[PDB]
Amino acid sequence: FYALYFEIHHLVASAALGFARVAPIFFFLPFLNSGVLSGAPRNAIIILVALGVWPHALNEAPPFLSVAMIPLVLQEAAVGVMLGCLL
Amino acid sequence: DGQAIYIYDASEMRNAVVSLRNVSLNEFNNFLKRSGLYNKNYPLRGDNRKGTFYVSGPPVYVDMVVNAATMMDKQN
Amino acid sequence: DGQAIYIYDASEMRNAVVSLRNVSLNEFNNFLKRSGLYNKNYPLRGDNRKGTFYVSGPPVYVDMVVNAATMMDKQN
Amino acid sequence: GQAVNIRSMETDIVSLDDRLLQAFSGSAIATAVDKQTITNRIEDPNLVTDPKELAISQEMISDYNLYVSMVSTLTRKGVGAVETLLRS
Amino acid sequence: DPKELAISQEMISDYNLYVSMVSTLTRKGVGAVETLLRS
Amino acid sequence: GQAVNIRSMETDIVSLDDRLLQAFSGSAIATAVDKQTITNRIEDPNLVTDPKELAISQEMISDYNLYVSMVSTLTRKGVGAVETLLRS
Amino acid sequence: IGQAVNIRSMETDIVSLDDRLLQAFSGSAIATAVDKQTITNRIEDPNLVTDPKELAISQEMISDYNLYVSMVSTLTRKGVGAVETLLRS
Amino acid sequence: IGQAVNIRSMETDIVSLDDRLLQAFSGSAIATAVDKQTITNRIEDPNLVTDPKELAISQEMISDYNLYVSMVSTLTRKGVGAVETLLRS
Amino acid sequence: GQAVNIRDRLLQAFSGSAIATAVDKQTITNRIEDPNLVTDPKELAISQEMISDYNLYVSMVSTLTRKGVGAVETLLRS
Amino acid sequence: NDISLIALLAFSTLLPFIIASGTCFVKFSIVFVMVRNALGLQQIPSNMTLNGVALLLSMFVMWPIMHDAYVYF
Amino acid sequence: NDISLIALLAFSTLLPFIIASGTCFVKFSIVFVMVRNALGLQQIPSNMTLNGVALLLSMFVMWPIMHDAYVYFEDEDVTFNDISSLSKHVDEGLDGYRDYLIKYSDRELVQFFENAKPSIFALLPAY
Amino acid sequence: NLQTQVTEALDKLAAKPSDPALLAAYQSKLSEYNLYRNAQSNTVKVFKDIDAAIIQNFR
Amino acid sequence: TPWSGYLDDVSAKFDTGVLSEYNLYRNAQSNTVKVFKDIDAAIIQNFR
Amino acid sequence: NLQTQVTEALDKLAAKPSDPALLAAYQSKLSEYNLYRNAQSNTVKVFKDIDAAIIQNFR
Amino acid sequence: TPWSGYLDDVSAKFDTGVLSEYNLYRNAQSNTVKVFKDIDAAIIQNFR
Amino acid sequence: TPWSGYLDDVSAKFDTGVDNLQTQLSEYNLYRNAQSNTVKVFKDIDAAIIQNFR
Amino acid sequence: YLDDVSAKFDTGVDNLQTQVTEALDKLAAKPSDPALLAAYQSKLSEYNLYRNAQSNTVKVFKDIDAAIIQNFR
Amino acid sequence: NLQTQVTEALDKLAAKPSDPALLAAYQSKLSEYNLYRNAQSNTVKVFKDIDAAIIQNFR
Amino acid sequence: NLQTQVTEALDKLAAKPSDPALLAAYQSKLSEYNLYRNAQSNTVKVFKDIDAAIIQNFR
Amino acid sequence: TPWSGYLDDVSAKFDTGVDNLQTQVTELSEYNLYRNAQSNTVKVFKDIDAAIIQNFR
Amino acid sequence: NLQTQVTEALDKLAAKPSDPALLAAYQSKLSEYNLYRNAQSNTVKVFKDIDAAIIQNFR
Amino acid sequence: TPWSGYLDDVSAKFDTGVDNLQTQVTEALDKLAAKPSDPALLAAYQSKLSEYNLYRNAQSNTVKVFKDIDAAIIQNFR
Amino acid sequence: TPWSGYLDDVSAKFDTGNLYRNAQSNTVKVFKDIDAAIIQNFR
């Protein structure tokens, strides 16, 4: 019974990179920014939106494991601010 | 006290009451008279052959009478 | 103390009262006269053949008399 | 004897909830019949006077004690993992 | 079981620390972009 | 034998910082001796046997512990009041 | 051995909200007050404490009181913390 | 061993809420000082602690002393915590 | 028979505390993998000290790093 | 039977993030920040109380939905 | 022993307000934004950066007096049996900082404030 | 219902406290009730402890 | 009113049963109450 | 009022410590007071600990 | 029907198996039941 | 003061209950067996409350 | 694992549980032989060592796993 | 001052370890000192615990 | 590799559960393995807790 | 230094309280109970302090 | 230096494990070292715990 | 290596303090069981079993006192 | 090597010193419980 804990545990790791991709669109959009949205239910929305759109299957292990993590965050933020300035 | 002169203001005088078990007041007054720590201005108030007495004086005289009185009953 | 001259100011004089069990004051004074640390300006105040006494002087003289009395009485 | 199904092929699921609901129903019926199958073992007198049956029931008590606490801290850590992300 | 629980004892805890580490870096990651856009 | 020091020394203060600083030195000298005298009571193994001198060494821990815990949390509040007013 | 049960629960539509919570509060306070007496006069009665037949029941009721009030304590604490996380912002 | 009770609980007018709190503080510090000196004189008399009947009495005075000051501590803590959230706003 | 042998400041500080926590991690690691040292009481007491100052060390440089980087943000937002 | 309590407490811990996402509290909170912003007032009316007045209407609507869960479970 | 750790931890907590007020950082960060308002630009060069360049400069010159605080206090000669010499010991530890504030503060304002060798607590607003 | 046949064998030994077969059967009853009673007490205790541990974990 | 308990009752089964007849009489009567006394001490510990 | 008939049975065995019926009744008394006293001690304790658990939860 | 556990069955093996003969027949009998007693009294403390 | 307590009362109750049993063997054996038994009872029934204080 | 530390005592002896039963079958057959009393006391006293060394090793292994599981949290 | 009359009864039993009345009074003394010492130990502990609880609550 | 030489001593006592020297050496083995296992469990626990404290400080 | 604790002082009191009881049994219920209560009392003194060292923390 | 005279008294009892005065003195030694070791363990533990409480307060 | 611990130290310290009690009670079991009526043989093995029971309980309860202190340390680890 | 205990020595004083077999067989069980209860007072 170890895989049941591991299935939610691979998910909560996968949603962090999903947050890092889609978080700077919720700053850019005029009907979604912090001026129109509060603090308490904002971070509930941004996680489950990336959970409903994440491309790889959830029960599988993510390929993030110790490749290069601090520059990976600056990749996903740079493409996030790119998608923000296009949208 | 034979080696120095201490001076305090009047609002610092301390009081103490101490009861000895196995030595008398007249035997402790001989320890103050023979050693030279006797003081006629602030003597010891109490019955001469008993254990309970009353002291009041400078804070270096009171602490010396109490600490030299409670250190004789551990020896006698 | 036979080797150097310590100088303090007058508001640094400390004093103490100690009690010996199996060593007399006349024997401790004959030790201080045997060693040369006997100081006639700051002598020991107590009964000449008893166990309790009072000492007052410079802080290097008081801590010497206390540390040699409570290490001489424990040896005897 | 006992049964093992050999092919645990990953039946791909539309969300993780049907998997959680089947794991919860797979184990609630497990622990419900365990809580009876050791209690009725205690409640019959012929089961408890035999030392041979008695250390078997000592064994199943130690299994049932170790099981629910192994599910307990595993889910408390799973909830603790998901709230630190969702709090923000 | 004393060696299998011990190797699963490390195996749960290090992966729990890894998921908290990857989520705290994402929070300071996008928060640095937020403050730099406010400048 | 025993020996007490009847004369306590004092110095004049003119400002406000030295009044804090003599409390700083009085607490550092209080904790430096009370960390040591209970360890000397523990290291002398005749003192660790009698229940009388066990009970006085029992309560000397609680006197040390409540004192240092009190001066920690008072300073935590004291700097918290400088923190919040300057944050505004 | 004396028992009694009431079967039909009172139920209707109230658009009023607080009186249902008042009935929930009084229904829990009375049921936790009758049992603290029932366990206490079982323990001060010196006939019930000596019988091994009655003692098996006596260990049960102290556990049923123990698990019940601890359950309400943890449910309410998560309840008042849930409103706290939304209003504190 | 021969006791006495006083029956008059006087009333002085409060001139403010500050005048009310000084009575509530002085009325509670006496009760917490007296009960702790009661349990010390119960202990320091050694003939009271060797009898079986007086021990559950001292158990009761212990558990009341713990529950009283813990209930006033958490309540004053949540009170000033209620002040801090409003002042932060 | 027993034997014995005898023998930017931030860039030396982080390197100095780098192996200072590693050798104290490893010396209680092979203290506990050696089973002769975990059975003796007076070896257990000095390992209990060795754990406790290990905890105080990395907690002290933890919080002092936290307040060290804690002093820069308030001045920089100003 | 025992792990039904684990499922209850684990549901209990994740409750206010469900109120953060699933219910209609998200309609009241946004329009109440918008009526503050359109008036030009920045700090007032002190949105800690505006969360509370927006919460009480959403509970006032959500109560018949959540009440049938208790009697069913 | 444990009074030294609470005193150092209190210094780490108070450190932003001391560098915000007590040291020479206020001479830097004021006159940096004075040039921006002299030129007439409002958000250029975006004073978050300019506080950075004022901080590395003020830390670069405050650090030598800070290095003196180590070599006086990391030694083992702190054991004084009488508490007043230990008090004057830690008086002489901060003496370089006090000498720096005396070097850069006006004289008569300090003695007006300690009217209420001078105390470090009194000259701090006068600096 | 074990306590019934506990309470039915003591009286015939009361009428005859010298029959050798009866005290053998009576001891075989009463020690068996000793084995039953602590079994019920020990078995309810774990069911309390694991039920208290979950709320101890989740509080 | 003198109260009676269960240990009185089991000793009341024994006391009404009546020289070697009288001294093997206190033989088993000592055994039964001492063995009945410890069976609840574990359970009365088992509240906590 | 249990302590009264506790304190009333010790004196007749004290005056006559050889009656076989009396020490049987005396032991039958003292073990029941043994069962009563720890029962009262164990029952006040749960009412204290669960009262401490609420303030432990809400603090 | 009376419920007969394993220790009732071993006493039934002593009874249904059939002065100095009959007394030592009890002498071996009064100890073997205490032996069967404390062996199951050894498992019971190990539940908790 | 020379303090006497309840265990001194119950242990002297064995001695002062009889007239001259201490001066005048099977009687004195069981009399010690009950005297030594009742203090083992009384030292336990209080000590359970002693551990039950905290 | 916990079945196997129990089953090593049922495997390590062949048929002792039946050897005691056939022994007491002979004891109830002819309860008057000295070699039969001595053989029964030699076969009966090995059983209480056997089962109490069966139940005590699983008792000490129970708390060892209980120390393992509680240090998860 | 309990330790004085503790320290005065052990020596007469040391000089005569066969007097039956003395070991009865000595056991009645020493178990009573046993009841006193842990009572003092348990009672200082709660006064520590509740004083520590206030700074744990207010910190 | 401690569990190997643990698991090599149980079988000779299984074949002979009456040797006095063997169960003395077996207890000398098993209590030392008891001291080893919880020591490793308690020591990994601090290395997890202090690793969780850094992210608790910096979050 | 040759060190003796208070427990050793109790056990030594059974050695100095007797005069020749250690010699005359070589030269029996007296030696039975004199060694019985000695071990029982040193067991009590072993136990009475052990609750207090736990009550330290 | 307590461990020296611990390690010097077990061997004469090892050579003679039937002397009544010696094993009495050996138990009087070894239980006293038992009282010493957990006392040292409990006293270093509080000095760790209150030192950990300061960083717990100030973090 | 066949490894030894401190608890194996104290147990084999009992086994090296004694020399031949594991076989000398077998030789008195050889002697007394040959003719089981001799008064110089009944007390011979009865003097061998007595020291065997005292020595085997002495090697046993020492183990528990040297166990529980090391239990108290590891309980004081966290 | 002939190993000796002191329970081997009290047998040697009985050799070097039907009632002889009743005095020794009782005094050897005197030590068998006195020195067993002393080491049972360890725990």
The first and second tokens of residue C33, run together, are 């006269």
Cβ contact (<8 Å) for C46 and B35?
Answer: yes
> Do residues B67 and C17 make contact, with C-beta atoms less than 8 angstroms apart?
yes
Q: Which experiment gave this structure?
A: cryo-EM
**A48: CB partners within 8 A, 6+ apart:** J21
Beta bridge partners of C45: C54
F44 phi and psi angles, rounded to 5 deg: -80, 110
Phi-psi group of K46: left, alpha or beta (phi > 0 → left; psi -120 to 50 → alpha; rest → beta): left
Cβ pair J2:D86 closer than 8 A: no
Q: Are strands F3-5 and C14-19 parallel, antiparallel or unpaired?
A: antiparallel
Taking phi over 0 as left and psi of -120 to 50 as alpha, with beta for the rest, C36 belongs to left
CA distance T19 to T37: 18
Q: Which residues contact F43 (CB under 8 A, 6 or more apart)?
A: none
Alpha-carbon distance of T41 to R23, in angstroms, equals 11
Phi and psi at residue C19, to the nearest 5°: -130, 125
Contact S46 I55 (CB under 8 A): yes
Q: Which of T3, T48, T49 sits opposite F45 (nearest CB)?
A: T3
* J25–G87 C-beta distance less than 8 A: no
Determine whether the interchain pair U11/V14 forms a contact, defined as Cβ–Cβ distance below 8 Å.
no
Q: What is the CA radius of gyration of chain Q?
A: 18
Beta bridge pairs of residue C57: C14
Contact between residue A47 and residue A15 where contact means Cβ atoms under 8 Å apart? yes
H or E stretch covering U52: helix U20-58
Evaluate whether C45 touches C31 at the Cβ level (below 8 Å): no
10 Å Cβ neighbour count for F61? 21
The gap from C-alpha R30 to its chain's centroid, in whole angstroms, comes to: 8
Tell me the C-alpha distance between R54 and M15, whole Å.
59
Distance CA C50, CA C71 (A): 18
Rounded CA separation V29/V49 (Å): 10
In chain Q, the residue whose alpha carbon lies closest to the alpha carbon of S23 is: Q53
Distance of residue F17 Cα from the nearest chain C Cα, in angstroms: 23
Other beta carbons within 10 angstroms of residue K60's beta carbon come to 9
**And the tokens for I75?**
């001045």
Helices assigned H by DSSP within M1-48: 6-15, 20-23, 25-37, 41-45
**Cα–Cα distance for residue pair R29/P9, rounded to 1 Å:** 11
DSSP 3-state of G50: coil
* Cβ count within 10 A of residue K107: 11
What distance in Å separates the CA atoms of residue T7 and residue T43, rounded to the nearest whole number?
Answer: 10
d(CA I23, CA I17): 10
CA N41, CA A6: separation in Å to the nearest integer?
47
C-alpha V5/C-alpha I36 separation (Å) is 5
Phi, psi of V61 (to 5 degrees): -85, -15
Query: Positive or negative, the Cα torsion across V11, V13, V18, V22?
Result: positive
Decide if L15 contacts M17 (C-beta within 8 A): yes
Widest CA span of chain L, in angstroms? 61
- Omega before K45 cis (within 30°)? yes
Do Q68 and E2 lie within an 8 Å CB cutoff?
Answer: yes
Residues of Q in contact with O14 (CB under 8 A): 28
S8 to chain Q: nearest residue by CA? Answer: Q8
Tell me how far apart the alpha carbons of residues G62 and G71 are, in angstroms, rounded to a whole number. 14
Contact, R48 vs T51, CB < 8 A?
A: no
Provide the H-helix boundaries in chain H: 17-44, 53-88
By CB atoms closer than 10 A (0-12, 13-18, 19+), residue O41 is: middle
SS3 of chain V: helix, strand, coil, percent, to 5: 80, 0, 20
Q: What is the biggest distance separating any 2 CA atoms in chain D, rounded to whole angstroms?
A: 59
Q: Does M45 touch chain G (CB under 8 A)?
A: no
Q: Which residues of chain U lie closer than 8 angstroms to K2, CB-CB? A: 50-51, 54
Q: Does D62 touch chain L (CB under 8 A)?
A: no
**Distance of alpha carbon T8 from alpha carbon B27, whole angstroms:** 41
Measure CB to CB from residue F51 to each of R37, R51, R55 and give the nearest one: R37
Q: Are strands B45-46 and C14-19 parallel, antiparallel or unpaired?
A: unpaired
- Tokens 């410590």, located at residue: N17
Of A22, A41, A25, nearest in space to A33 by CA: A25
CB D78 within 8 A of CB A9: yes
Burial class (CB in 10 A: 0-12, 13-18, 19+), E8: middle
Amino acid at site W8: D
What 8-state DSSP symbol labels residue G10? Answer: P
Token pair 């206030």 is at which residue?
R54
**Token duo for residue A62:** 């993510």
Q: Give CA–CA dist J38/A36, Å, rounded.
A: 11
Q: Which residue has the tokens 């029962």?
A: N39
- Quick check: helix, strand or coil at residue F48? coil
Torsion of the alpha carbons at V15, V18, V24 and V28, rounded to the nearest 10: -120
Q: CA-CA distance, B67 to C52, in Å (whole number)?
A: 10
**Alpha-carbon distance I52 to nearest alpha carbon in chain U (angstroms):** 7
Fill in the amino acid letter for F52.
K
Task: Judge whether H73 and R54 are in contact, CB under 8 Å.
Answer: yes
Amino acid at residue number K109: L
Q: Given CB atoms, is F52 within the 8 Å cutoff of chain T?
A: no
What distance in Å separates the CA atoms of residue K50 and residue K20, rounded to the nearest whole number? 15
CB-CB neighbors (< 8 A) of E3 in chain Q: none
Q: What angle do CA I19, I22, I24 make, to 5 degrees?
A: 110
Q: Rg for chain D (alpha carbons), in Å?
A: 18
Nearest to C49 by CA among C18, C73, C25: C25
User: What's the rounded Cα separation, in Å, for the pair O44 and D49?
Assistant: 11
∠K91-K96-K99 over CA atoms, to 5°? 95
CB atoms inside a 10 Å sphere around CB L32: 27
Give the Cα separation of L58 and T55 in Å (integer).
Answer: 29
List T residues 18-57 in contact with W (Cβ-Cβ < 8 A). Answer: 28, 31-32, 35-36, 39-40, 42-43
Element (H, E) at C45: strand C45-46
Enclosing H/E stretch for J48: helix J48-72
Q: Which residues contact Q71 (CB under 8 A, 6 or more apart)?
A: E9, S41, S42, S44, S45
SS3 assignment, position P13: helix
- Cα separations in angstroms, L19 against L12, L26, O34, S46, V2: 9, 11, 19, 66, 61
Q: Which residues, at least 6 apart from N5, have a Cβ–Cβ distance to it below 8 Å? A: M2, M3, N29
For residue D75, the 8-state DSSP code is H
The DSSP secondary-structure symbol of Q71 reads: T
Amino acid at site W6: Y
What is the residue extent of each domain of chain R? Answer: 1-59
**Interstrand relation of B14-19 and B52-57 (parallel, antiparallel or unpaired):** antiparallel
Q: Cα angle at J58 between J55 and J62, to 5 degrees?
A: 135
Radius of gyration in angstroms for the set of CA atoms belonging to chain W, rounded to a whole number = 13
Nearest Cβ partner of W36 from V24, V43, V53?
V53
M22 to chain L: nearest residue by CA? L17
Write the CB contacts of N55 (distance below 8 Å, at least 6 apart in sequence). Answer: H70, H71, H74
Mapping DSSP to helix (H, G, I), strand (E, B) and coil, where does residue C55 land?
strand
In the DSSP assignment, the letter for residue A61 is P
Computed from CA positions of residues W11, W16, W21, W23, in that sequence, does the dihedral angle turn out positive or negative? negative
